[PDB]
Amino acid sequence: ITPGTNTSNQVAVLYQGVNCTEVNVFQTRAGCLIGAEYVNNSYECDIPIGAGICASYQSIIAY
Amino acid sequence: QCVNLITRTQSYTNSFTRGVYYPDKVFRSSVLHSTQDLFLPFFSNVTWFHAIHVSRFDNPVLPFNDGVYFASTEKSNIIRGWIFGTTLDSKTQSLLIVNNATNVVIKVCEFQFCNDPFLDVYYHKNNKSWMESEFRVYSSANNCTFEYVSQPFLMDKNLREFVFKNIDGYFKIYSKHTPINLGRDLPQGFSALEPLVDLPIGINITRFQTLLALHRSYLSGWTAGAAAYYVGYLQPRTFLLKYNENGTITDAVDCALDPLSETK
Amino acid sequence: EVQLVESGAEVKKPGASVKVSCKVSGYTLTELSMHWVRQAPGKGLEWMGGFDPEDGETMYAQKFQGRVTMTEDTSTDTAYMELSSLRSEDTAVYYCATSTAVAGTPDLFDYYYGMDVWGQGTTVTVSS
Amino acid sequence: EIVMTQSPLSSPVTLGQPASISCRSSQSLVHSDGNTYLSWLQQRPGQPPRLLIYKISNRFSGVPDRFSGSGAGTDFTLKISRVEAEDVGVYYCTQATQFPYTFGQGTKVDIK
Amino acid sequence: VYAWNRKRISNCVADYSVLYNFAPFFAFKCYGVSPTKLNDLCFTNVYADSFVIRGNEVSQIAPGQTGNIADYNYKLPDDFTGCVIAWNSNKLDSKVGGNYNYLYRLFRKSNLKPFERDISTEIYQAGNKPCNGVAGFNCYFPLRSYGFRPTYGVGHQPYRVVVLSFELLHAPATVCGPKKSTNLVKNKCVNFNFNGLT
Ligand SMILES: *[C@@H]1O[C@H](CO)[C@@H](O[C@@H]2O[C@H](CO)[C@@H](O)[C@H](O)[C@H]2NC(C)=O)[C@H](O)[C@H]1NC(C)=O
Ligand SMILES: *[C@@H]1O[C@H](CO)[C@@H](O)[C@H](O)[C@H]1NC(C)=O
Ligand SMILES: *[C@@H]1O[C@H](CO)[C@@H](O)[C@H](O)[C@H]1NC(C)=O
Ligand SMILES: *[C@@H]1O[C@H](CO)[C@@H](O)[C@H](O)[C@H]1NC(C)=O
Ligand SMILES: *[C@@H]1O[C@H](CO)[C@@H](O)[C@H](O)[C@H]1NC(C)=O
């Protein structure tokens, strides 16, 4: 998961369908997300992760 | 005439994006070409060696691994070549590259190499000239199998970069000379290494040495000397190279260094 | 530092050649100008002969020409001297001296002359 | 052939006092290389001569700072600031510019 | 076979037809190039690797083949291109008392790399007991001699093997065909042969 390289070089990594114990660590139903912190505030979807989870750049947040 | 004479200290630094070479002999213009070869990984651990003579055996032997990236900001008159082999005695084959002020000369023989080998210059009164001696490099050279003399590649602030690969019999040397403005010796940016010399060697190489020129004092039998050089190791690894309109590799991405790089 | 060693002293009937040696250690002899000097007991010390870096190779005294001949062995790093037609006044202590052929770095070097390091003398005795 | 003169032949010197020895050359010892070439040697009985000074003022390795050299052209002086029991012997001035190499007659220095 | 002789071929024009004109070669086997197309190509990186082996081991000098000389004496890479030349040498490399000049490395700890020569005369430990440089029980010398005799039939007679190795198009060619060059023509639809590239 990245924004544009014009914007930033920071990335998040989604290990799809993998629990977080078999690999900023967040557990989604889509998989384990590394490098993005979860935010309780809800926004419009920018980068789709899956299972209701999306990512955006503000650092990279997941919501 | 083998003496243990040179001491050496080491430090650790970052490779940044150095060590890129042209993977083949094909011109490519304004393309993005992905190749898997023995490349120096980006931002890797590169050992900085300071080899010191002041006027015991303190010059340890480095393994060759799969290939060597070599760099030096120091001038071309003290550092004058390399040694390659496995045991560095008369039992096995040995490869020697010596640069001097007129040409470069390369042997593959069975050298009986000294523990601390160095080319030493001294004045000969019969020749009435400063001549070079290899008697401290080795004691003997018999059953010699290969010889090659060419135009030299250590000539004259100036960062000299070399890539040595030993693939299926051929010893491939890539080189580049870059004028580096006063600062960090290993600069940022890309300087692609043109394929310089492909030697038909066909020997086993797992260990190497780097060859120093030592001057007699005529005033502690040798003049004190200093040399600084960076050594990194190549890995079988995939790069993506950017060829511009003039055919120069101006930029690259190493695929495993970052996840974003892998996306690139 | 150049170290000079000598051979043993000798006594000889006049009319024969004398082989006098000087062995160099620490340095090899091709970097060194090599010279030879006699000293009589009760007299001032004067010169056999020695090397010339430029305008020739080896120079001799004017009164001792035709008798002194000088050889250098590069393999054993030795200097041999031969002197024929012995005289009763030749009972003397013989000194082998040496000095650096050049001085300076390879880019800037100058030719040197002199007698810096001297070895131990050998006693040449001419008797019955 | 360059002929030189040493002065004085014998100099009785007491302990600690400086002594001056004059070497005079009949020909000028200037060389085409620029530097004039004079060497002073000291000889002890039972000992070969060793290089005390080379090129007027420049010091040889192991030579103490008790010795000084001065002069130019055809007139040179060697000065001994302190004379001890190891300074007894014969001193020589020699040239290395023009062949043949000729040596002085020597100056004998003692204690009493 | 353990100290196989490796000769570079470069800076020549090669007439391969004279190999066909005089030919006692029983085995003439090329892998990546047709035998009649050697005169139609340009080459560099050209080698001749010569050794003497048994008559039944000439099949073992190939990419991916199985043997003792294949893994301990001489190994070919999997992407090898070139030609193997194997011919009987019973008239020259055999003696009635026994020609024992040709030796092979029977025993070694690990397999070789492709295009690697091993001349080390060290002992091999073939058992749990170490040998300590002395032959004995379960300790045998690696280099053993062939019992070449002319009274034997084909298949045990000594066979000389020369391996010609090339590269294709990845390097400036120095070994080329016997054809003469043609004058250059510009801006005109022609078919061209630049160093084997048609
Ligand atoms: C630089 O190295 C080359 C290679 O050895 C020297 O060239 C050789 O010099 C010897 C002199 O003894 C000749 O016999 C050879 O024929 C020369 N070979 C070639 C290929 O020229 C050269 O003299 C060296 N230069 C310096 C200044 O040391
Ligand atoms: C390089 O390796 C040394 C150990 O050999 C280690 O201490 C050092 O941290 C490494 N450098 C980097 C940048 O990780
Ligand atoms: C290597 O040299 C030695 C002595 O010169 C000789 O005995 C030996 O046969 C030689 N080996 C080869 C392979 O030429
Ligand atoms: C490429 O070549 C052109 C023509 O020689 C030159 O003007 C230009 O500076 C070169 N470099 C780049 C980056 O375009
Ligand atoms: C090459 O040399 C190294 C060390 O000398 C050794 O471990 C290795 O086995 C050699 N290669 C082969 C193919 O024997």
Coordinates of N, CA and C in Angstrom, one line a residue, chain A residues 9 11 13, chain B residues 259-260 264:
Chain A
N9 N 7.4 8.3 0.1 CA 8.0 7.0 -0.1 C 7.6 6.0 1.0
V11 N 5.5 3.2 2.9 CA 4.6 2.1 2.4 C 4.1 1.4 3.6
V13 N 2.5 -2.7 4.4 CA 2.5 -4.1 3.8 C 1.4 -4.9 4.3
Chain B
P259 N 10.0 -2.7 0.0 CA 8.7 -3.2 -0.6 C 8.3 -2.3 -1.7
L260 N 8.5 -0.9 -1.6 CA 8.1 0.0 -2.6 C 9.0 -0.3 -3.8
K264 N 8.1 -1.1 -7.7 CA 8.7 -0.5 -8.8 C 9.1 -1.6 -9.8

